[PDB]
Amino acid sequence: LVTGGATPELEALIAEENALRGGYSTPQTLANRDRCRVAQLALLDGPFADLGDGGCYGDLFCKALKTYNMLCFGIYRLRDAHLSTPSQCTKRYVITNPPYEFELVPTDLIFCLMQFD
Amino acid sequence: LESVSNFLKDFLHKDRDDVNVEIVFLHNISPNLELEALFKRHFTQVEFYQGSVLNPHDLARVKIESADACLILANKYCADPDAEDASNIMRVISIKNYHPKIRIITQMLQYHNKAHLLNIPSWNWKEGDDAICLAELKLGFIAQSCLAQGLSTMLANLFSMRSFIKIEEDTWQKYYLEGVSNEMYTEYLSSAFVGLSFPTVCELCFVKLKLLMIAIESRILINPGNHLKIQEGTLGFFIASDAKEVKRAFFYCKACSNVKKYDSTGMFHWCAPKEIEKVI
Amino acid sequence: LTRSEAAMTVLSGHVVVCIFGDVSSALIGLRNLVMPLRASNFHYHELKHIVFVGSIEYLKREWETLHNFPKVSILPGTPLSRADLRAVNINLCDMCVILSANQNNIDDTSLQDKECILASLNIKSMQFDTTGVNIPIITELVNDTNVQFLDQDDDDDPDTELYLTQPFACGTAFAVSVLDSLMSATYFNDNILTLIRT
Ligand SMILES: [Ca+2]
Ligand SMILES: [Ca+2]
Ligand SMILES: [Mg+2]
């Protein structure tokens, strides 16, 4: 997940030659691209944006998983978004694996793993 | 004192299941009064023996020939990273020389020294020899924060064992702590979920069992597509509050073109070796 | 040499010399190792080729006494580089010799022979289209107690003397501490030092 793949083949190559060597394109090379990539996506636009104010994290988790083969392990929520008063602070923080009942606000970002095209 | 105190807090945490693995320490310095008090607070689970890891007599004393693994902590704040890496390499060499078939988990400061170490004849990464390279993992975590900011914090909190902490104040800290209370686990999952799609068992597990799956055991597959069917006898990489919750994943049955664009493995982008003045 | 010409130059029955030199390291004096190989009671077709792998600074701090000898070569690399040792045909040599110059500058009695031990293990952990355990290898150690890490099948004991250790009994390791009896031998028999020297 962290180095973007390091299979035993690459670990042998870097142990013998201690550099990445370029390869010609092959069908197995084009198959090795299919693995998920970590992402953030916005909640203010696109198909997920109907989860506005007062939406449930369980609804979002379900619709993302059912329809886009995509699932979320956390919310990158604005620090002051739980306050009543507006604030100019743009700092957010990681909420991990929240309840199905957990409440959304429209200014949010979602951590998820997404498919390859 | 701090190294042992931090290690024992994570090894003996109440969120793991009822493990009774004894911990034996081997060090060549007599422990100070605060370390002796720390070992007395863990009197039934920790034993200390004074010796050198480079001595086969001491290695036989700590019964390393029957130990389940050997853990080699490193001085992350050392003045000479090269000297620390050399010392850890010597320790690994001595342990492997005494017993080739011992699982060794060690911390390595640099990546070239890790490459130096993995050439040991007894060093078998398949058998379970893990060199946790600090510089590599930290730079990888920083790079994943460049793909999604906050992901270094997200990953780091999944390893440290943490209980739920709750306070009456409505502050960002309450929500943050509630999120921090979850770790990554691993266990085998019910025959009642064999034959279904990975998305389907994920939406089933999510709030009914209260369990989230990131991956399953073509072995290690990060977030499988909807086209993959759950093999019989597989394990799921759950995120959960603790180990005693993920037991449900098992204990359930309807209880309702000559251009070289890439490396040789097809996993990284590549180009011809640019001169330094070209890129300055 | 470099990687290209080393790899295409076929070598067999040669001597490979692995040097962990440095700009501040002491002079080993490789003349005294080369001269016995270069002796004239061997025919010219029988002279084993010599190649030195090590820091280019240290090689250009000693080459001033090795330019009158034939069949010699330098490769400016690392004795621990698998690519260099493969390019030098390490599996076909009659000997690999491992020497370290950084032995007196540091005072740890733990890292004195670390580089030599690591190089020996790297050479013994090589796969050839045979394994690297059958390669003819000799290494010089500063501490006699470090000889226990050279082999894994042998039984190790700090009390066991170096002469009794398996890697020394096989001619795989050599330490300067075994020469201490030459004081007594030389005194009692004045011709023994010249018989040995010749
Ligand atoms: Ca927990
Ligand atoms: Ca041994
Ligand atoms: Mg006990």
Curated annotation (Swiss-Prot), chain B:
Changing residue 232 to A: Found in a patient with epilepsy; uncertain significance; no effect on voltage-dependent sensitivity. Residues 253-256 are annotated as: Heme-binding motif. Residues 196-216 are annotated as: Segment S8. Residues 139-159 are annotated as: Segment S7. It comes from the Eukaryota. Widely expressed. Except in myocytes, it is almost ubiquitously expressed. Phosphorylated. Phosphorylation by kinases such as PKA and/or PKG. In smooth muscles, phosphorylation affects its activity. Mg(2+) binds at residues 22, 45, 47. Belongs to the potassium channel family. Calcium-activated (TC 1.A.1.3) subfamily. KCa1.1/KCNMA1 sub-subfamily. Homotetramer; which constitutes the calcium-activated potassium channel. Interacts with RAB11B. Interacts with beta subunits KCNMB1, KCNMB2, KCNMB3 and KCNMB4. Interacts with gamma subunits LRRC26, LRRC38, LRRC52 and LRRC55. Beta and gamma subunits are accessory, and modulate its activity. It is linked to Paroxysmal non-kinesigenic dyskinesia 3 with or without generalized epilepsy: An autosomal dominant neurologic disorder characterized by absence seizures, generalized tonic-clonic seizures, paroxysmal nonkinesigenic dyskinesia and involuntary dystonic or choreiform movements. Onset is usually in childhood. Patients may have seizures only, dyskinesia only, or both. The protein was initially thought to contain two functionally distinct parts: The core channel (from the N-terminus to the S9 segment) that mediates the channel activity, and the cytoplasmic tail (from the S9 segment to the C-terminus) that mediates the calcium sensing. The situation is however more complex, since the core channel also contains binding sites for Ca(2+) and Mg(2+). The S0 segment is essential for the modulation by the accessory beta subunits KCNMB1, KCNMB2, KCNMB3 and KCNMB4. Potassium channel activated by both membrane depolarization or increase in cytosolic Ca(2+) that mediates export of K(+). It is also activated by the concentration of cytosolic Mg(2+). Its activation dampens the excitatory events that elevate the cytosolic Ca(2+) concentration and/or depolarize the cell membrane. It therefore contributes to repolarization of the membrane potential. This is Calcium-activated potassium channel subunit alpha-1. It comes from Homo sapiens (Human). The lineage of its organism: Eukaryota, Metazoa, Chordata, Craniata, Vertebrata. The gene is KCNMA1.
